[PDB]
Amino acid sequence: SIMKILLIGDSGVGKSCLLVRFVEDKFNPIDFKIKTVDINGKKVKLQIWDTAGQERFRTITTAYYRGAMGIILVYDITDERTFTNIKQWFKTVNEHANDEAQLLLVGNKSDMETRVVTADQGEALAKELGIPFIESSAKNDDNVNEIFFTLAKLIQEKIDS
Amino acid sequence: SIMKILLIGDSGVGKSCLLVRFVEDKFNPSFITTIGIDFKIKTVDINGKKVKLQIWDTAGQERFRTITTAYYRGAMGIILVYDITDERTFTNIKQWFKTVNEHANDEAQLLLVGNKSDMETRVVTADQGEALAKELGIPFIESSAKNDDNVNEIFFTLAKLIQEKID
Amino acid sequence: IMKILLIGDSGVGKSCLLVRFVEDKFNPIDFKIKTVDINGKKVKLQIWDTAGQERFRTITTAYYRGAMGIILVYDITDERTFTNIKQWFKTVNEHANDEAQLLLVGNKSDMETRVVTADQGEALAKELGIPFIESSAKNDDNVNEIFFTLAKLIQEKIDS
Amino acid sequence: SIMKILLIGDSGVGKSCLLVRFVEDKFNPIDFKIKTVDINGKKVKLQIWDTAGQERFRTITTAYYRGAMGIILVYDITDERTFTNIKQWFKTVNEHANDEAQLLLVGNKSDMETRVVTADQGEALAKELGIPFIESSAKNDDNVNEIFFTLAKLIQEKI
Numbered sequence: 064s065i066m067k068i069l070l071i072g073d074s075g076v077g078k079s080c081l082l083v084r085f086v087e088d089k090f091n092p093i094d095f096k097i098k099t100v101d102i103n104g105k106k107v108k109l110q111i112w113d114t115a116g117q118e119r120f121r122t123i124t125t126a127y128y129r130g131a132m133g134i135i136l137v138y139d140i141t142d143e144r145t146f147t148n149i150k151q152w153f154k155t156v157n158e159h160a161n162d163e164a165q166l167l168l169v170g171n172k173s174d175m176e177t178r179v180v181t182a183d184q185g186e187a188l189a190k191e192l193g194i195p196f197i198e199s200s201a202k203n204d205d206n207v208n209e210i211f212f213t214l215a216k217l218i219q220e221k222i223d224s
Numbered sequence: 225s226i227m228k229i230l231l232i233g234d235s236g237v238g239k240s241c242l243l244v245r246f247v248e249d250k251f252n253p254s255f256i257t258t259i260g261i262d263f264k265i266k267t268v269d270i271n272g273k274k275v276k277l278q279i280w281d282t283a284g285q286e287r288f289r290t291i292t293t294a295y296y297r298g299a300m301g302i303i304l305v306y307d308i309t310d311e312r313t314f315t316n317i318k319q320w321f322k323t324v325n326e327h328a329n330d331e332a333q334l335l336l337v338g339n340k341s342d343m344e345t346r347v348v349t350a351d352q353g354e355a356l357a358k359e360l361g362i363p364f365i366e367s368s369a370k371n372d373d374n375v376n377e378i379f380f381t382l383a384k385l386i387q388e389k390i391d
Numbered sequence: 392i393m394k395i396l397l398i399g400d401s402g403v404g405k406s407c408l409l410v411r412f413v414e415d416k417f418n419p420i421d422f423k424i425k426t427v428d429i430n431g432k433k434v435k436l437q438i439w440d441t442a443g444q445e446r447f448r449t450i451t452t453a454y455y456r457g458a459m460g461i462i463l464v465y466d467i468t469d470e471r472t473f474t475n476i477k478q479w480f481k482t483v484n485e486h487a488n489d490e491a492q493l494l495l496v497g498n499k500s501d502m503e504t505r506v507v508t509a510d511q512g513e514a515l516a517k518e519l520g521i522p523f524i525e526s527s528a529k530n531d532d533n534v535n536e537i538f539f540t541l542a543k544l545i546q547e548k549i550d551s
Numbered sequence: 552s553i554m555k556i557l558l559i560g561d562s563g564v565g566k567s568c569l570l571v572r573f574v575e576d577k578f579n580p581i582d583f584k585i586k587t588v589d590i591n592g593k594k595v596k597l598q599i600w601d602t603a604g605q606e607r608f609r610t611i612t613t614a615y616y617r618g619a620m621g622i623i624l625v626y627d628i629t630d631e632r633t634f635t636n637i638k639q640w641f642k643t644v645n646e647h648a649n650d651e652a653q654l655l656l657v658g659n660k661s662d663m664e665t666r667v668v669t670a671d672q673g674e675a676l677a678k679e680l681g682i683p684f685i686e687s688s689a690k691n692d693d694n695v696n697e698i699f700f701t702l703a704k705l706i707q708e709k710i
């Protein structure tokens with residue numbers, strides 16, 4: 064009952080760190096990892112993919128999206144540009160992912176005082192895009208597990224409908 | 225949650241002192257801010273809910289930054305300050321108002337503050353301040369960072385107006 | 392990394408301003424590095440300073456390649472170095488990048504033999520459309536401010 | 552059985568002396584030593600590796616880490632540079648050592664009045680790296696045994 068989940072977004076927002084915090088629970092300043100969780104009383108294996116710093120030289124590959132049922136769009140709350148770029152990522156993902164894939168918006172680095180994107184702004188963009196929103200901190204381990212459990216539950220719902 | 229507030233005005237009117245009095249409850253006649261960290265944080269209760277204020281304050285010879293569009297990005301509150309003992313800083317408020325209106329977002333709430341009300345050498349009356357505020361269409365408050373007079377009121381008044389409009 | 396250049400007539404104190412900023416010392420290859428903390432980040436400043444006989448080099452187009460900050464310096468005790476600022480401004484604008492942020496510095500403010508007033512410097516800066524700061528590498532007055540002010544303007548620009 | 556432990560850090564911080572103080576209980580101003588310890592009513596043989604000065608001329612040989620279950624990162628509290636370099640050592644160890652290896656940060660030469668790195672700073676870095684912290688003095692025999700016993704227990708614990 065594997066669930067393929069992708070982390071997408073501008074380089075530098077903290078994608079690889081969120082994944083490391085979730086699987087290993089660590090932070091420090093074969094492109095996937097596995098972690099098994101329980102969903103509605105059933106063991107679910109999450110196959111979590113990390114871009115491998117390749118979003119800097121070319122668009123996401125086809126086989127990358129193949130089988131992906133969850134796609135997490137991440138931006139940096141301290142970097143306006145990465146937030147503005149979310150619309151482009153959303154477009155790219157929609158023009159290539161399965162029609163039933165569930166998306167989720169994550170505003171990362173909520174621990175930083177240098178924040179320039181407010182929670183209200185993130186919530187507003189998520190609403191406009193029609194997807195759930197979560198603010199996290201891979202550094203302080205804030206809401207990281209929630210990202211994956213929230214997304215996994217939404218995916219389990221689509222599968223059963 | 226977070227409210228970005230800027231303190232603007234002629235150098236020497238008491239902007240940094242007002243911020244220090246509000247956040248650290250201190251006042252140094254010879255205080256000197258640190259070149260590097262431009263803002264401080266303080267969480268206050270507005271309508272029974274926690275609001276984090278991100279208060280920005282620039283140094284004198286870093287004044288060029290206060291005329292750029294980038295500096296006002298995201299600010300929802302802008303406090304214009306003058307020295308009641310220095311006519312020139314009061315006269316300059318109109319220029320600051322212009323700069324703020326042209327480089328900042330039209331949704332930001334402004335507030336006029338006449339500081340150093342503790343000084344007997346005052347030359348700008350409260351009526352004059354009130355009159356300018358009215359002309360500009362913004363709230364007015366006289367304060368004294370030195371004697372801790374009406375400093376908290378500056379920020380709570382502004383925060384409530386910003387919230388009152390967020391709705 | 393942020394490439395910053397110090398330009399101006401020989402003898403105004405360019406090297407002494409750089410030494411004071413990095414080594415905080417004052418003594419009466421062409422660049423030094425110093426990491427500063429702005430907007431909660433470690434920005435590395437690559438500060439360039441050239442000798443007198445290397446002046447011929449400071450007027451070339453390659454010297455300004457990549458520079459995002461350019462500090463124009465004059466001696467407040469030497470009218471000629473102040474008058475020459477307009478020529479330096481012209482050379483910089485014609486040989487440097489349009490996005491580069493300039494800043495005018497009047498150095499040696501500690502000297503009683505000053506002949507250029509702060510008001511004059513402020514007026515020229517206004518005319519040129521750039522920030523102005525008076526400093527003293529000798530007494531460590533406003534030296535850090537020169538670089539932090541410039542670094543912030545360069546950053547605001549990058550993010551703008 | 553046997554527990555392989557390595558001491559890593561800038562040259563001159565006192566790695567070799569900490570090992571001598573622990574095994575021979577001596578101080579003076581093969582590349583490994585053996586010492587059998589008792590942990591929770593159980594005897595454990597510690598194979599403690601000394602760098603042999605390698606750090607002064609080369610990257611620690613990939614096989615030097617092989618089999619290591621304990622790695623002690625050491626700095627000199629009187630030398631800021633050796634403390635700053637700990638982050639690089641941590642990176643090198645994490646990229647070449649075994650995943651299960653337990654790390655520990657040691658601030659040595661605590662006997663010196665010329666200290667420039669505070670205990671708080673050391674504790675803060677240890678926390679940031681996610682590893683235990685101990686300040687020692689091979690010279691005054693302060694907390695040297697604690698280094699090895701603490702690490703041995705964490706390794707056993709991880710077993």
Ligand SMILES: Nc1nc2c(ncn2[C@@H]2O[C@H](COP(=O)(O)OP(=O)(O)O)[C@@H](O)[C@H]2O)c(=O)[nH]1
Nearest residue numbers: 074075076077078079080091092172200201202
């Ligand atoms: N303050 C802060 N920094 C973070 C967080 N997550 C990642 N970072 C930092 O952001 C940079 C990029 O993170 P990384 O995970 O490699 O980004 P990726 O390109 O999206 O994979 C690194 O310098 C991280 O230490 C966070 O939650 N808070």
Ligand SMILES: Nc1nc2c(ncn2[C@@H]2O[C@H](COP(=O)(O)OP(=O)(O)O)[C@@H](O)[C@H]2O)c(=O)[nH]1
Nearest residue numbers: 235236237238239240241252253340368369370
């Ligand atoms: N008497 C008096 N002096 C004040 C008050 N506030 C600031 N000052 C003094 O005015 C000078 C400049 O204040 P400062 O906060 O640095 O001004 P800024 O340039 O606007 O940041 C300092 O000498 C302060 O002690 C006040 O409420 N009363």
Ligand SMILES: Nc1nc2c(ncn2[C@@H]2O[C@H](COP(=O)(O)OP(=O)(O)O)[C@@H](O)[C@H]2O)c(=O)[nH]1
Nearest residue numbers: 401402403404405406407418419499527528529
């Ligand atoms: N009084 C005084 N002398 C200074 C200052 N800065 C540099 N000088 C002196 O001016 C001369 C030239 O300085 P230097 O940095 O080599 O000038 P450059 O040609 O612009 O590099 C030396 O004698 C310095 O000691 C200053 O801030 N005050």
Ligand SMILES: Nc1nc2c(ncn2[C@@H]2O[C@H](COP(=O)(O)OP(=O)(O)O)[C@@H](O)[C@H]2O)c(=O)[nH]1
Nearest residue numbers: 562563564565566567568579580660688689690
């Ligand atoms: N004061 C003092 N000196 C120490 C201590 N430990 C080692 N030293 C001295 O530091 C120098 C280097 O020690 P050594 O063990 O060879 O360092 P290594 O390069 O890390 O192996 C020698 O001069 C030692 O005597 C200590 O705890 N206190």
Ligand SMILES: [Co+2]
Nearest residue numbers: 078079115116
């Ligand atoms: Co990455």
Ligand SMILES: [Co+2]
Nearest residue numbers: 239240282283
């Ligand atoms: Co101030």
Ligand SMILES: [Co+2]
Nearest residue numbers: 245249372376
């Ligand atoms: Co008070």
Ligand SMILES: [Co+2]
Nearest residue numbers: 405406441442
């Ligand atoms: Co020179």
Ligand SMILES: [Co+2]
Nearest residue numbers: 411415531535
């Ligand atoms: Co200094």
Ligand SMILES: [Co+2]
Nearest residue numbers: 450451452486
């Ligand atoms: Co030419």
Ligand SMILES: [Co+2]
Nearest residue numbers: 566567603604
């Ligand atoms: Co040694």
Ligand SMILES: [Co+2]
Nearest residue numbers: 572576577692
């Ligand atoms: Co002993």
